[PDB]
Short mmCIF file of C-alpha atoms and ligand atoms in Angstrom, two decimals:
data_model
loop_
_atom_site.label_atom_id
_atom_site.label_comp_id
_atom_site.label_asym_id
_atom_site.label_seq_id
_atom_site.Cartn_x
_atom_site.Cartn_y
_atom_site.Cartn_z
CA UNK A 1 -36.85 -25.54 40.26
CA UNK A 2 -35.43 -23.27 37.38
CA UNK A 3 -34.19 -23.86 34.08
CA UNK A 4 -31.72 -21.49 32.25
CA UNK A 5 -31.66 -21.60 28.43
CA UNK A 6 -29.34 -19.25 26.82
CA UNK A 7 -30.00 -16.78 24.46
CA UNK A 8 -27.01 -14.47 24.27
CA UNK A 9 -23.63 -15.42 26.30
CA UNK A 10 -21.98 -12.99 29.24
CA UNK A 11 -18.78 -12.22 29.99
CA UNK A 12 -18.36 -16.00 31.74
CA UNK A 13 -16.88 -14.37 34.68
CA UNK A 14 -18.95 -12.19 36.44
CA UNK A 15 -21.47 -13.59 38.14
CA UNK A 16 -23.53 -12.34 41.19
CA UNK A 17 -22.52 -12.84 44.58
CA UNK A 18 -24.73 -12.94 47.81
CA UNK A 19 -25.41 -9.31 48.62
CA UNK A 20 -24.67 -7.73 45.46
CA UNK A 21 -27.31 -5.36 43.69
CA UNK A 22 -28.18 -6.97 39.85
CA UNK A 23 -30.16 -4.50 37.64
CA UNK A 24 -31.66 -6.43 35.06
CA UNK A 25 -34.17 -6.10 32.11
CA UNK A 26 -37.01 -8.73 32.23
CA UNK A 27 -40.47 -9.86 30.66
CA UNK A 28 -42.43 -12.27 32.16
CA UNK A 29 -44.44 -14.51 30.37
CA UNK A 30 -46.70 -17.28 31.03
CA UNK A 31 -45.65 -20.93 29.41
CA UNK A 32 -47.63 -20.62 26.13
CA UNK A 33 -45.90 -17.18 25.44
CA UNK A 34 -48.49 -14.56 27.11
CA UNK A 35 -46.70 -11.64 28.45
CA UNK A 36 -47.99 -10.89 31.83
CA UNK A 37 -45.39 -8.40 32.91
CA UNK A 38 -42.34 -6.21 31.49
CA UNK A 39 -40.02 -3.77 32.89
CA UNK A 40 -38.63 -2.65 29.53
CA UNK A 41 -42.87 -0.68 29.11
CA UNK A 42 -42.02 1.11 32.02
CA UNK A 43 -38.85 2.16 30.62
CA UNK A 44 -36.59 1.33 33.69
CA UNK A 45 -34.64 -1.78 34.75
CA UNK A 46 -35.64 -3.71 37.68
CA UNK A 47 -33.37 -4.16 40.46
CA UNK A 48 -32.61 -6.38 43.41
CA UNK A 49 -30.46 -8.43 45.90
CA UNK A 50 -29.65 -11.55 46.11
CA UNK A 51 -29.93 -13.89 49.37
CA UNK A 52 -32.42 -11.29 50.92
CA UNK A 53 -36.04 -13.62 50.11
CA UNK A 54 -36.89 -10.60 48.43
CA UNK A 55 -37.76 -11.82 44.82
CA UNK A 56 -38.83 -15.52 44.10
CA UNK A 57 -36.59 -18.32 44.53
CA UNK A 58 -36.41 -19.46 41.38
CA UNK A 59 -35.73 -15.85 39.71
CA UNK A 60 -32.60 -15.93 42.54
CA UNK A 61 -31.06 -19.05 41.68
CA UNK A 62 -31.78 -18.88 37.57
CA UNK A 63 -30.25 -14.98 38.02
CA UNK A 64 -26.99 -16.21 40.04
CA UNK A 65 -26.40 -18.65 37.23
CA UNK A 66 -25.73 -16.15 34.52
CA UNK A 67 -23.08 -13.69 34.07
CA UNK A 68 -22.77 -10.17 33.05
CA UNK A 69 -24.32 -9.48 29.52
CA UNK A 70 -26.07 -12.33 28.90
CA UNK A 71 -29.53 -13.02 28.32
CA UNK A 72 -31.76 -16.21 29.32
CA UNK A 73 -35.10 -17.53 29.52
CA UNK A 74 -35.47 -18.98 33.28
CA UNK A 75 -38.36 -21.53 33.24
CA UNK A 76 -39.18 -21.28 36.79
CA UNK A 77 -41.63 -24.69 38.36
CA UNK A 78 -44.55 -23.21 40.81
CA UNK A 79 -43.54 -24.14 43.88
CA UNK A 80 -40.31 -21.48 43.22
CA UNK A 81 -42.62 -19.02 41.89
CA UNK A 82 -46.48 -18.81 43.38
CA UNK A 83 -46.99 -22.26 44.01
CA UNK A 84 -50.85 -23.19 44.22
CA UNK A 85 -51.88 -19.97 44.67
CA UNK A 86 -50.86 -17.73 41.36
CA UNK A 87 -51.28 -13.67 41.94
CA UNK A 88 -54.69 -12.21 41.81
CA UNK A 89 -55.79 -11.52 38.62
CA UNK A 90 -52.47 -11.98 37.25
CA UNK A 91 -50.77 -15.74 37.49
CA UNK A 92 -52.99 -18.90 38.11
CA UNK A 93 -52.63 -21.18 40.19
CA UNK A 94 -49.96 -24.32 39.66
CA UNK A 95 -48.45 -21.97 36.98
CA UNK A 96 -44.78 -22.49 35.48
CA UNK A 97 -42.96 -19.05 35.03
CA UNK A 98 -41.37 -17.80 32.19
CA UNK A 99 -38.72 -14.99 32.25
CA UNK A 100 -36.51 -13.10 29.34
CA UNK A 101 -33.67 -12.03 31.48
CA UNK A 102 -30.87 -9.75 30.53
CA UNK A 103 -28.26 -8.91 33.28
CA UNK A 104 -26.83 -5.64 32.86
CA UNK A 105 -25.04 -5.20 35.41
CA UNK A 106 -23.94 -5.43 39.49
CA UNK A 107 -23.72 -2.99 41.99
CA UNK B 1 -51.74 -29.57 50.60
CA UNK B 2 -54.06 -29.03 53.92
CA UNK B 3 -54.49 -31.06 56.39
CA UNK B 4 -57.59 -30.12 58.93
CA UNK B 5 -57.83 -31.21 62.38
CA UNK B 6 -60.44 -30.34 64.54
CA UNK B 7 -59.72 -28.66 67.82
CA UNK B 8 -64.09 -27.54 68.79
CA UNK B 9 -66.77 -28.71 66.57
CA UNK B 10 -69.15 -25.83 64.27
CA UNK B 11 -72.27 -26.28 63.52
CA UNK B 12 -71.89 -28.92 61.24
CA UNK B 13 -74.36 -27.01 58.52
CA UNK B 14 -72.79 -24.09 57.53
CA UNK B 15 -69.86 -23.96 55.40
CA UNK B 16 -68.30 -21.29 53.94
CA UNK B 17 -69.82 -20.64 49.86
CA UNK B 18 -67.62 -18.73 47.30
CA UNK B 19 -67.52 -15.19 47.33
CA UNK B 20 -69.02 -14.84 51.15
CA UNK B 21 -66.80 -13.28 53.41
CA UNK B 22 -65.16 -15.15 56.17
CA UNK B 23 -64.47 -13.85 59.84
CA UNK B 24 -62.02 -15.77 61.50
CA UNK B 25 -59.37 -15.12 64.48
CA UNK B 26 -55.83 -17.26 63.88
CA UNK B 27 -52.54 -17.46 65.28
CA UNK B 28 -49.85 -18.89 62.44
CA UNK B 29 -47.00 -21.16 64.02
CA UNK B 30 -44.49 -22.55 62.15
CA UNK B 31 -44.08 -26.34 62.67
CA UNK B 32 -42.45 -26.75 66.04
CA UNK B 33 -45.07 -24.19 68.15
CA UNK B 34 -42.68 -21.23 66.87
CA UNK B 35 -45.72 -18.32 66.45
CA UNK B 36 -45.38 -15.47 63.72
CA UNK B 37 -48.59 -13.95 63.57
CA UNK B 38 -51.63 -13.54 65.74
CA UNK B 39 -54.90 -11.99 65.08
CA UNK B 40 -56.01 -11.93 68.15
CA UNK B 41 -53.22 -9.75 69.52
CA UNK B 42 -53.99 -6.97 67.25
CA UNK B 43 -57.57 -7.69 68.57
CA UNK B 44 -59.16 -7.60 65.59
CA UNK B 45 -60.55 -10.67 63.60
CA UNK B 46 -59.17 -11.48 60.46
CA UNK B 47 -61.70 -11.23 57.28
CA UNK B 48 -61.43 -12.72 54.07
CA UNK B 49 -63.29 -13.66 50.90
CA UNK B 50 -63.24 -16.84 49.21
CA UNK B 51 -62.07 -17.73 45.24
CA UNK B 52 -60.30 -14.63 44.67
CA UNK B 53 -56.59 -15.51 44.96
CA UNK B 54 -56.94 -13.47 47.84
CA UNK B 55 -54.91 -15.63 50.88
CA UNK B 56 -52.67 -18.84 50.38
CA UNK B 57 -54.28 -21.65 48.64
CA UNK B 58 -53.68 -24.05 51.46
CA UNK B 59 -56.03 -21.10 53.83
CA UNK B 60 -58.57 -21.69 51.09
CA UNK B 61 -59.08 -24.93 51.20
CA UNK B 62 -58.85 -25.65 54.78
CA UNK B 63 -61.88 -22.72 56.21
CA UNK B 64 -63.70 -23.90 53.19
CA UNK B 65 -64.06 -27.50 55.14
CA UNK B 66 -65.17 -25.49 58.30
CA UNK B 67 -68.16 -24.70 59.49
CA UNK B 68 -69.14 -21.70 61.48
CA UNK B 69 -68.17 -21.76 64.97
CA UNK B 70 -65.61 -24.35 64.55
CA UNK B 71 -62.13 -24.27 66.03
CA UNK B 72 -59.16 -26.51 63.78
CA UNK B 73 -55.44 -26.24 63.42
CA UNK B 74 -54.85 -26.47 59.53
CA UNK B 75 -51.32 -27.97 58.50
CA UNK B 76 -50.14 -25.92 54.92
CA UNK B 77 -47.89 -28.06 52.63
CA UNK B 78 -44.88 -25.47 51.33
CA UNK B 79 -46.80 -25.38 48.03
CA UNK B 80 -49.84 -24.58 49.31
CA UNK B 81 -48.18 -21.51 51.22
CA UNK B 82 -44.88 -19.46 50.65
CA UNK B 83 -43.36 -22.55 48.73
CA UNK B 84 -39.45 -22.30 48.40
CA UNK B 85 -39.89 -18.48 48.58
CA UNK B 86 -41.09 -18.19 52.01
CA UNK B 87 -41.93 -14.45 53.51
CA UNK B 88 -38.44 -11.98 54.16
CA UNK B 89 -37.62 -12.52 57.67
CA UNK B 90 -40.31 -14.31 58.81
CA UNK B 91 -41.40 -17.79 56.94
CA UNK B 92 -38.39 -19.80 55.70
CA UNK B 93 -37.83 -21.38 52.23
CA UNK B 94 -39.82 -24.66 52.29
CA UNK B 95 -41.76 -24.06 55.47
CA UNK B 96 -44.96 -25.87 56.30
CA UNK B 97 -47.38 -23.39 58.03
CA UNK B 98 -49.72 -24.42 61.21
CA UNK B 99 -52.88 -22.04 61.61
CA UNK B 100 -55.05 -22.41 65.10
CA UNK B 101 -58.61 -20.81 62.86
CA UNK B 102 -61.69 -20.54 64.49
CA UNK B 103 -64.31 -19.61 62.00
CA UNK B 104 -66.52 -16.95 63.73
CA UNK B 105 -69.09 -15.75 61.32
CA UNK B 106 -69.70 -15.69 57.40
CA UNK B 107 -70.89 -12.46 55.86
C1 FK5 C 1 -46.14 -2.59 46.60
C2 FK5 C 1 -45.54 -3.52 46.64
C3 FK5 C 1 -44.16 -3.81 46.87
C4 FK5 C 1 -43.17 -4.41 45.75
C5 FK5 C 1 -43.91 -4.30 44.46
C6 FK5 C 1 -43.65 -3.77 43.31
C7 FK5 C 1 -42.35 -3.08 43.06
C8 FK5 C 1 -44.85 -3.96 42.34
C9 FK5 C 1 -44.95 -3.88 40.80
C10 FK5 C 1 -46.42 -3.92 40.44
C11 FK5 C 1 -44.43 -4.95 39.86
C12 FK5 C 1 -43.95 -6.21 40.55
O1 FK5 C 1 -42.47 -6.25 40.44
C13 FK5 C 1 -41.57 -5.29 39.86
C14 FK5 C 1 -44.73 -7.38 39.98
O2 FK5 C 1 -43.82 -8.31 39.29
C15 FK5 C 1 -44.54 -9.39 38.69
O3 FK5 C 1 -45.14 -8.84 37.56
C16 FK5 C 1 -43.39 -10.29 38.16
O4 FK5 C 1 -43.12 -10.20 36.98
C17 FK5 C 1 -42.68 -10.97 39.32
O5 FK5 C 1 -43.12 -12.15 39.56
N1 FK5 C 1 -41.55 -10.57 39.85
C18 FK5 C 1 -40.75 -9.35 39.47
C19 FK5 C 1 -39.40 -9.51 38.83
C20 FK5 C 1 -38.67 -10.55 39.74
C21 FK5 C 1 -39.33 -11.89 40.01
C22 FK5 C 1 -40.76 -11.63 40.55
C23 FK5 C 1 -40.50 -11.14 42.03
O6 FK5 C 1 -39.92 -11.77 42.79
O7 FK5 C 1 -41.22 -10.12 42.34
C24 FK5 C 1 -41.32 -9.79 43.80
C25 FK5 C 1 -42.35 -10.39 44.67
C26 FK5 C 1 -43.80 -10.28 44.12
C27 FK5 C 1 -41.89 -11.24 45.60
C28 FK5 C 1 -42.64 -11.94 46.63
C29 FK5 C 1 -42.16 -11.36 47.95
C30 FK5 C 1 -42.72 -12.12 49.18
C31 FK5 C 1 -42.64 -13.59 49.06
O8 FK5 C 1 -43.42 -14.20 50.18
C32 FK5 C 1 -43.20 -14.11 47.77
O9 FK5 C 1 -43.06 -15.50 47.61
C33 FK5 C 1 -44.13 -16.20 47.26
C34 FK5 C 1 -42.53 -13.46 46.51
C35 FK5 C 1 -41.31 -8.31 43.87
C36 FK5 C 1 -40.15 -7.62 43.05
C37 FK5 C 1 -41.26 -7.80 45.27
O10 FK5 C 1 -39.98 -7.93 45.99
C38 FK5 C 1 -41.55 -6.27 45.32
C39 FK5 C 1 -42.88 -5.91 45.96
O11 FK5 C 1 -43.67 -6.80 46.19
C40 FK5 C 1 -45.41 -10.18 39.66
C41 FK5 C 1 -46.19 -11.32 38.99
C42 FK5 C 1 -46.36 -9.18 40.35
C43 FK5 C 1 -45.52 -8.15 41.04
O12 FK5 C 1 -46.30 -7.19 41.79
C44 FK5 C 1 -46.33 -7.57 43.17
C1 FK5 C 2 -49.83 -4.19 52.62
C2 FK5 C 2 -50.15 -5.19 52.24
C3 FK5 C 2 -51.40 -5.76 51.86
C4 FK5 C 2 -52.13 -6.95 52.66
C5 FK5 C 2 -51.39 -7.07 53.95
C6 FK5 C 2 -51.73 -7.05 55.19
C7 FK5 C 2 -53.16 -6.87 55.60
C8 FK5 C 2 -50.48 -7.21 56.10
C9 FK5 C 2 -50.32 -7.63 57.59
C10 FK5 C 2 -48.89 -7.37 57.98
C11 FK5 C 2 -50.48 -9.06 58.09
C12 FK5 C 2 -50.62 -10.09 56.99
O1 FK5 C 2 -52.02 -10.58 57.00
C13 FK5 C 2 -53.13 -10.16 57.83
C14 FK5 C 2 -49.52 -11.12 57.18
O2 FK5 C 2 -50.10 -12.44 57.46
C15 FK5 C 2 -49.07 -13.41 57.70
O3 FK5 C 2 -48.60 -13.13 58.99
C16 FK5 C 2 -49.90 -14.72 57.84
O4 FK5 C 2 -50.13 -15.11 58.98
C17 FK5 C 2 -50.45 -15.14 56.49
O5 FK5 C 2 -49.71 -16.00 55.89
N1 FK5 C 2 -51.67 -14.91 56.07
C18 FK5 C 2 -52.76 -14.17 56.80
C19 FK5 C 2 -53.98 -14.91 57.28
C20 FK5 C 2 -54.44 -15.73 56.04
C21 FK5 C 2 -53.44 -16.67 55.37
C22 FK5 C 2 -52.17 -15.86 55.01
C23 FK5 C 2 -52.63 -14.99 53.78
O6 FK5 C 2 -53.05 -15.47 52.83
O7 FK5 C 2 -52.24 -13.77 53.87
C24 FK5 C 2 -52.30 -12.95 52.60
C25 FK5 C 2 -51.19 -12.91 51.64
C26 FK5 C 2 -49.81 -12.60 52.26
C27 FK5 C 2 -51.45 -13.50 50.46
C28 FK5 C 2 -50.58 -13.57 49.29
C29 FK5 C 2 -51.27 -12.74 48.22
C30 FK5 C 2 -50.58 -12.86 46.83
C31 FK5 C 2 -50.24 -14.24 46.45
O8 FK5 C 2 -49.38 -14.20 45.23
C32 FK5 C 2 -49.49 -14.99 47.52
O9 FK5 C 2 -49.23 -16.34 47.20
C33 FK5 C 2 -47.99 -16.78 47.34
C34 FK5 C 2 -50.25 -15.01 48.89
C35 FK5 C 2 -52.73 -11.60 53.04
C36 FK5 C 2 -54.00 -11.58 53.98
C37 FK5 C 2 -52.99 -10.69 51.89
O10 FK5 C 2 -54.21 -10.92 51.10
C38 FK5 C 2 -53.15 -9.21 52.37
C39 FK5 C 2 -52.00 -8.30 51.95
O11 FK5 C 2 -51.00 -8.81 51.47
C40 FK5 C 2 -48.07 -13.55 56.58
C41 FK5 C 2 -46.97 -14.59 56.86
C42 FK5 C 2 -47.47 -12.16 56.30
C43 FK5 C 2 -48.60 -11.23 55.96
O12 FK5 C 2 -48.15 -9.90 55.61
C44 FK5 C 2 -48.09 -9.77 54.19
#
């Protein structure tokens, strides 16, 4: 349910494991281009685990696909995002995902 | 992505209208009896309101079909739920949800 388009390569070695910590720079956008979130406006990158259910599914397996550096767009279907519902005020429902990645790093 | 069976007939008349407020009491199983959650054991009865993104689609559309005083078990497609997500430690990926709703009063 994702699909990872490449914008700038990694180091095509390092990629994240179950368990390890990836800090990342995103932007989410909806599918005709209108930003909905970014963690780059609150200055900070946003981090998280992998295997842990913690972020959507599809931002977990389009993030374990890329490798240190790079930077992707991760089209991500509903039903591996918010499915029928959306989020209040924020994502419709049935809604396909779109995400700027950039992996910085792992810890 | 509901399915509605009826366990106690409502009234047959009144049906929940968008934006009232539904009280309900529910117990959420997951597909072989397995229960996570139970209103009714932290006494309390659940409220909601309608058309405002507010609970999982699949809720939505299933107490909309009800009318007041009925009693149904409502079977929740994955995409109509926590999709391939599920909830950290306590839905799986891909899970179809069963709720036992009785629909006690609109406000
Ligand atoms: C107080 C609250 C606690 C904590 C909240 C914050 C730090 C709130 C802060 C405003 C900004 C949020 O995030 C930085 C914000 O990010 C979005 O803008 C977005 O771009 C998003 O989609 N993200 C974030 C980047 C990773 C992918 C995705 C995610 O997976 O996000 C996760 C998420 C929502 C996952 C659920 C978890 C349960 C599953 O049942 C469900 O599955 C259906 C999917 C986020 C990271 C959660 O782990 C963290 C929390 O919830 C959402 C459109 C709305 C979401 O606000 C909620
Ligand atoms: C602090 C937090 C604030 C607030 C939390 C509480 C009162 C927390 C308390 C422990 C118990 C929760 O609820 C009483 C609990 O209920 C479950 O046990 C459950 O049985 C459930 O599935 N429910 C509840 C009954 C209606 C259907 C469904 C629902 O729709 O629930 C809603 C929900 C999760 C909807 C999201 C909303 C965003 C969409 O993006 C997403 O779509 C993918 C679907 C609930 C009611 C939210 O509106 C309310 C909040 O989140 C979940 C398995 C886990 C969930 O804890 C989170």
């Amino acid at each position: 349910g994702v699909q990872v388009e490449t914008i700038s390569p990694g180091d095509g070695r390092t990629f994240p494991k179950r368990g390890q910590t990836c800090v990342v720079h995103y932007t989410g956008m909806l599918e005709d281009g209108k930003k909905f979130d970014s963690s780059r406006d609150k200055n900070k990158p946003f981090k998280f685990m992998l295997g842990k259910q913690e972020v959507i599914r599809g931002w977990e397996e389009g993030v374990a696909q890329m490798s240190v550096g790079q930077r992707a767009k991760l089209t991500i279907s509903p039903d591996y995002a918010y499915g029928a519902t959306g989020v209040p005020g924020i994502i419709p429902p049935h809604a396909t995902l779109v995400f700027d990645v950039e992996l910085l790093k792992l810890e």
